Amino acid sequence: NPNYCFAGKTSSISDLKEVPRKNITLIRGLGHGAFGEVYEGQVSSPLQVAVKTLPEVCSEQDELDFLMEALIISKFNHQNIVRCIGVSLQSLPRFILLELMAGGDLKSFLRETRPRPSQPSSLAMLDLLHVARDIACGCQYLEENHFIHRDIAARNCLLTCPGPGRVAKIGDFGMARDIYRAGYYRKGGCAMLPVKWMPPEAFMEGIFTSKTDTWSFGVLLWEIFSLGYMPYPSKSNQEVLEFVTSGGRMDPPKNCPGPVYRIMTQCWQHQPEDRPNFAIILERIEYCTQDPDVINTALPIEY
Numbered sequence: 001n002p003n004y005c006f007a008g009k010t011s012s013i014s015d016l017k018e019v020p021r022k023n024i025t026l027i028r029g030l031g032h033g034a035f036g037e038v039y040e041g042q043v044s045s046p047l048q049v050a051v052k053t054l055p056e057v058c059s060e061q062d063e064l065d066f067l068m069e070a071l072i073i074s075k076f077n078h079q080n081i082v083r084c085i086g087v088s089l090q091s092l093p094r095f096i097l098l099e100l101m102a103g104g105d106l107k108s109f110l111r112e113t114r115p116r117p118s119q120p121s122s123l124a125m126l127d128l129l130h131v132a133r134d135i136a137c138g139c140q141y142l143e144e145n146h147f148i149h150r151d152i153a154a155r156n157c158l159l160t161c162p163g164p165g166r167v168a169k170i171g172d173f174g175m176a177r178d179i180y181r182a183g184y185y186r187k188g189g190c191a192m193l194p195v196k197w198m199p200p201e202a203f204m205e206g207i208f209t210s211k212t213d214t215w216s217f218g219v220l221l222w223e224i225f226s227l228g229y230m231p232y233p234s235k236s237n238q239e240v241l242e243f244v245t246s247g248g249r250m251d252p253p254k255n256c257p258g259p260v261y262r263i264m265t266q267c268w269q270h271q272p273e274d275r276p277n278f279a280i281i282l283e284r285i286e287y288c289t290q291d292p293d294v295i296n297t298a299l300p301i302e303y
């Protein structure tokens with residue numbers, strides 16, 4: 001059985017909490033993950049869960065990838081990273097049971113909660129700053145524990161609920177799992193890499209540090225403040241690659257306050273040494289939340 005090391009501590013399949021198959025009920029499909037459907041489920045006042053499934057028709061590598069994902073998520077202990085309730089690997093199809101996030105993914109939340117004439121203040125600058133702070137908190141925990149996420153993006157973030165009081169969390173570690181297992185990428189190729197979220201040293205030299213996550217965080221900030229637009233509008237992966245290597249950077253999203261845009265530009269410094277760490281990113285987000293000129297800025301209303 002493969003071993004997994006995090007914060008200098010080793011774990012294996014035997015450390016995962018196997019939950020009896022009879023105690024799990026699938027309710028509805030929520031969409032698809034990297035390799036398999038994800039369901040809303042219940043574990044027996046039942047525990048509300050997200051059920052990641054492993055296709056029964058899969059290779060031995062798919063089975064080992066699935067196990068590694070369970071080990072990775074089960075070893076984290078942070079409020080801004082989705083909890084793992086357990087696994088059900090002794091029955092087919094195999095399951096990973098995660099904390100149900102009732103607000104769905106962040107990208108679809110921003111696109112659907114965008115202020116409209118119908119919803120005048122669905123969302124405000126403070127809601128965006130709270131999502132950004134929540135994710136920066138999770139990234140800080142990964143950085144302090146020497147774990148490089150490699151795929152910080154809106155599609156990988158989830159929300160506990162749609163309304164006020166929502167907490168944003170990192171809910172996917174598929175890229176980091178792929179690198180941990182083989183050392184490189186892997187199952188995919190050039191066309192599958194998250195090019196639009198990567199710094200120059202990453203796509204050019206294959207060099208990854210916590211400053212890689214800082215760059216991707218800046219891109220996530222743009223995704224947040226644009227209200228769910230795809231980064232580098234109208235540019236393909238190769239155009240982005242060339243644009244970014246030549247010093248090109250995204251313009252501020254529509255109505256973005258200057259102090260918020262300044263965080264993005266700092267995250268996008270060419271030299272990793274010039275980029276802020278997550279503690280500095282958090283201090284800057286915290287200062288933006290205190291500033292009336294930032295939080296009183298109206299979000300654009302989409303007609």
Ligand SMILES: Cc1cc(Nc2ncc(Cl)c(Nc3ccccc3S(=O)(=O)C(C)C)n2)c(OC(C)C)cc1C1CCNCC1
Pocket residue numbers: 030031032033034038040050052082098099100101102103104105108155156157158171172
């Ligand atoms: C994407 C999503 C996620 C959830 N909730 C949720 N909670 C926890 C996890 Cl781990 C999770 N995973 C998930 C779900 C769907 C597709 C892929 C994943 S994943 O684990 O592979 C990762 C990309 C988050 N979903 C979700 O939960 C419901 C109960 C609100 C709904 C959705 C969609 C449904 C169709 N409209 C847009 C939102």
